[PDB]
Structure 1
Amino acid sequence: NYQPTPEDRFTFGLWTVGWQGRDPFGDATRRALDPVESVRRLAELGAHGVTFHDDDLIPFGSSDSEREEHVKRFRQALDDTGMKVPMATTNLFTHPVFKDGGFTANDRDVRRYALRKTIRNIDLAVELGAETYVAWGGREGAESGGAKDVRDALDRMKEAFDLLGEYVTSQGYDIRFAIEPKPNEPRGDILLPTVGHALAFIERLERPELYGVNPEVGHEQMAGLNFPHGIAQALWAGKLFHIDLNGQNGIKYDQDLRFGAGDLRAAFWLVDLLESAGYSGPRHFDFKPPRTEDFDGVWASAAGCMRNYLILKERAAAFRADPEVQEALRASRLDELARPTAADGLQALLDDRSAFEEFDVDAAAARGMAFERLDQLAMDHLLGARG
């Protein structure tokens, strides 16, 4: 009944289930979860692996002595359970020294510090076997306009990612980076607000081949955009190295609801797309069990995630296979969208009088697109009202 298996590629962040529940207007409602503990409960539910921030596994300020002790206990846990670690990131947002940013902070000294803190937790990412490395520059921005020269910051940002590449290139690591956009929160405005702004940025770096994106549901939905639309340009441009799943009800604070929640009609068009294009990386889940819940609630919430994906995957599978849905698509000319417009060459088109001088625009404009039917059909499938 929609049971998950490691072969599904469902992964979680230690900081997701582990969220203690502290929000601007409230203290923590839950007690700390030990990383080994999250790992057994997850493996048990049907996951594949887990992701982490340096600061999640190794507490800030930890000596290299205690630092070994947390990596061994984790190491052992991964083995007794079989879980994997296909992605890792740095924590350049919590500590106060990052109040103005990491790679883009004004204090030059603060920038160097954040470049090392990363390089350090990259040697560990590999040591464990992570394939992708993500970077979320949440403290990279400004509330006021004279606080940041956006042109100077974009320089300090390319210089940061470049160095990192030169490092992985020398260290002959097979790892690749994933830049995660957010339009805002915790800064008034964040650098590289959406997938689009990050994709362009990557075509300016020295080694573009080593960079991609890790678009998150709610984040793109914080600017009011169509998430699936955005996962399309990344794939079209071959840059979807990773993805963060969750829920978001519109434009407002980053909610991070469990997957399926929020915009349900949208999560249906994402799975479909991810299945069609053959996305094989991990189906990550960057969510936060609400603070009105306890631990039995955190595990139910993380169960709902995978389960919602599985059903949606099914309901989408049928959608495409339905012999009737297939003819509606032809009725709406999605087959003609796939066909090149001018494979006949420019010259051919400039002389072809069927495209202008003789085109019957009136007869053509009267041709209905039949989009409302193909949708209600889609709707019956998601609800399971077809039969």
Structure 2
Amino acid sequence: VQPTPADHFTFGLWTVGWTGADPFGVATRKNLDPVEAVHKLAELGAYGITFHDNDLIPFDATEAEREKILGDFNQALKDTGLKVPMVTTNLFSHPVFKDGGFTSNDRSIRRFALAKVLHNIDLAAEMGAETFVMWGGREGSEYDGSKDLAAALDRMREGVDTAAGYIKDKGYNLRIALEPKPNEPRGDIFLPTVGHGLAFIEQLEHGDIVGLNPETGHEQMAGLNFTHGIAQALWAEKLFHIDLNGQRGIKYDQDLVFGHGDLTSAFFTVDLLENGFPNGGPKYTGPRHFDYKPSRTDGYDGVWDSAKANMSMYLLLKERALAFRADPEVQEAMKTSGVFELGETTLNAGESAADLMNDSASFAGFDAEAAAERNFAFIRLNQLAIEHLLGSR
């Protein structure tokens, strides 16, 4: 398994560029130059690279420096052919965003954050990004009395709808993807899980161009099923982008390589992205974006090892996932457990609530005790998946 650009593997500049400062220590690696990052990613088989405005252009850079940076960055894209499919804004590192960007209690920080986003959409358009991600990492609180909870959501809506109207107004070919996170850096973040994010989009004026950017480790921090969560987003037509990594449990965000966290969950994630639904339905066709960090204990050889590892993990899982579904023993196990039977409507074509109510066979003369003897054989069906995962079938 060697990745190729058709695999659609994209990586953020901040992933491989992560130098190692954590909350208990300083950087263990030297800064990575962005041009070197592009050359190196391209050589590993990456299709694209993504970034945050301040990942490339310093917060204080002059207009001269911005243009110098962009010129060399664009030259490296040209030299390699790496695309830039998603752009995002840093609304969390500088001290001004300590209470948030869009939901900052201070009004002058809310306008500064939103103006920073609007300018960044212009850069997104210019780079040819299809997706603009919004991760509201400082939107939230440590204490419950800190915020007017209704005002926080009106202010979040205002920012997202202003940005959305702006795209529509300039006719940029871009969609906004919100990225939910339960906590860290705030004690509680607004729109904590896939569900809150999706619910919030339905209250928006320009909801039609706003979708989601779920991250594996983020839903796992609330102990949620990531395949269940992305299935709902997909079902709603709202899975616009995805961030893949590993998390081992509810604890700080680890950002491990995809597959180095909950492996069985990683397998079924890949089955849903690659294979879709057993009875048919929607499919995710976007880039497979790795949002992780190379462990601070490792040197630059480990940084490129880790980038490679993300792509290998995905291709090994993909392989096992295609052999699993293709397996006739598996298809028959699925049929026994009622996987395809769930696809049939409960009601008959034209049957009404009254009809079903008044159908003695479905209720009054129904044998509940006979119906309960059914062996769904979910254990055996799970054993078949693990055996394909273990490369034993």
Do the two structures share a fold, i.e. TM-score over 0.5? Answer: yes
**SS of the counterpart of 2:362?**
coil
Q: What's the counterpart of residue 266 of structure 1?
A: 265
Give the root-mean-square deviation of aligned CA atoms.
0.7
Equivalent in the alignment of 1:323: 328
- CA–CA separation in structure 2 for the residues paired with 1:38 and 1:174: 27
1:372 pairs with 2:379? yes
**Aligned equivalents of 2:322, 2:112: Cα separation in 1:** 48
CA deviation after TM superposition for structure 1 residue 276, in Å:
2.1
TM-score (norm 2): 0.97
State how far apart, in whole Å, the 1-side matches of 2:267 and 2:360 are: 42
User: How many Å apart are 1:351 and its aligned residue?
Assistant: 2.1
Q: Encode CA deviations 1:287-317: one digit per residue, 9 max, x unaligned.
A: 0000001101100011110100001001000
Aligned to 1:358, what secondary structure does the other structure show? coil
Contact (CA 8 Å) 2:19, 2:30: kept in 1 or not? yes
TM-superposed CA distance for 1:149, in Å, is 1.1
- 1:348, distance to aligned residue in structure 2 (A): 2.3
1:118-157 matched pairs, under 5 angstroms: 118-157=117-156
Residues 1:19 and 2:18 aligned together: yes
**After superposition, where does 1:216-255 map in structure 2 within 5 Å?**
216-255=215-254
Equivalent-residue separation in structure 2 for 1:162 and 1:385 (angstroms): 51
Distance 1:369 1:159 in 2: 49
**Secondary structure of residue in 1 paired with 2:310:** helix
Matched-pair contact (CA < 8 Å) for 2:20–2:27: yes
The Cα of 1:146 is off from its aligned counterpart by: 1.5
Q: Deviations over 1:265-293 (max 9, x none)?
A: 00000000111233210000000000001
Counterparts of 2:209 and 2:374, CA distance in 1: 46
Match of residue 284 from structure 1: 289
Give the CA deviation at 1:381.
0.3
SS of the residue 1:289 aligns to: coil
The runs of 4+ residues in structure 1 deviating greater than 4 Å are none
User: The residue matched to 2:360 in structure 1 has which SS?
Assistant: coil
TM-superposed deviation, 1:367: 1.0
State the identity %.
Answer: 66
Under a length normalisation based on structure 1, what TM-score does the superposition of the two structures give? Answer: 0.99
SS of corresponding position for 1:354: helix
Residue in structure 2 matched with residue 332 of structure 1 by the alignment? 337
Work out the CA distance in 2 between the residues paired with 1:94 and 1:318. 44
Gaps of 5+ in 1: none
2 CA distance for matches of 1:377 and 1:260?
19
Name the SS for the 2:146 alignment partner: coil
Q: Which residue of 2 aligns with 1:49?
A: 48
Name the CA distance, whole Å, in 2 between partners of 1:173 and 1:372.
49
**For the Cα contact (< 8 Å) 2:321–2:388, is it kept in 1?**
yes
Contact 2:134 2:179 in 1 (8 A): yes
Q: 1:301 aligns with which of 302, 306, 315?
A: 306
Separation in structure 2 between the aligned mates of residue 248 and residue 228 of structure 1, nearest angstrom? 14
The separation in 1 between residues aligned to 2:306 and 2:298, in whole angstroms, is: 9
Q: Distance in 2 between matches of 1:141 and 1:18?
A: 27
Structure 2 residue matching 1:12: 3-state secondary structure? strand
> What SS does structure 1 have at the residue aligned with 2:11?
strand
Distance, in Å, in 1 between the alignment partners of 2:95 and 2:180 is 22
For residues 229 and 307 of structure 1, the distance between their equivalents in structure 2, rounded to whole angstroms, comes to 24
Amino acid aligned to 1:318 = A
> Is residue 312 of structure 2 the alignment partner of residue 313 of structure 1?
no
1:345 Cα deviation after fit? 2.6
The answer for the alignment partner of 2:70 in structure 1 is 71
Q: Deviations over 1:49-68 (max 9, x none)?
A: 00000001101111111111
Aligned to 2:352: 345
For residues 166 and 384 of structure 1, the distance between their equivalents in structure 2, rounded to whole angstroms, comes to: 50
Deviations 1:12-70 (A, max 9, x none): 00000000100110010000001111101100001100000000110111111111111
User: 1:355 is matched with which residue: 362, 376, 383?
Assistant: 362
Is the CA contact 2:357–2:363 (under 8 Å) kept in the aligned structure 1?
A: no
Q: How far did residue 126 of structure 1 move?
A: 0.8
In 2, Cα distance between equivalents of 1:352 and 1:322: 39
Question: Could you tell me how far 1:347 is from its partner in structure 2?
Answer: 2.9
Deviation at 1:145, TM superposition (A): 1.5
Question: By how many angstroms is 1:361 displaced?
Answer: 0.6
Q: Is the 8 A contact 2:275 2:322 kept in 1?
A: no
Distance 1:114 1:203 in 2: 23
- In structure 2, what is the equivalent of residue 186 of structure 1? 185
Separation in 1, partners of 2:62, 2:208: 36
The 3-state SS of whatever aligns with 2:145 is coil
Equivalent residue number for residue 170 of structure 1: 169
Counterpart code for 2:77: L
Tell me what 2:2 maps to. Answer: 3
Who is 1:106 aligned against?
105
**Gap regions ≥5 residues in structure 2:** 277-282
Query: 1:372 & 1:122 partners in 2: Cα distance?
Result: 49
Distance 1:45 1:345 in 2: 58
Helix, strand or coil: the match of 1:146? helix
CA distance in 2, matches of 1:194, 1:22: 27
* Counterpart contact for 2:334–2:340, Cα < 8 Å: yes
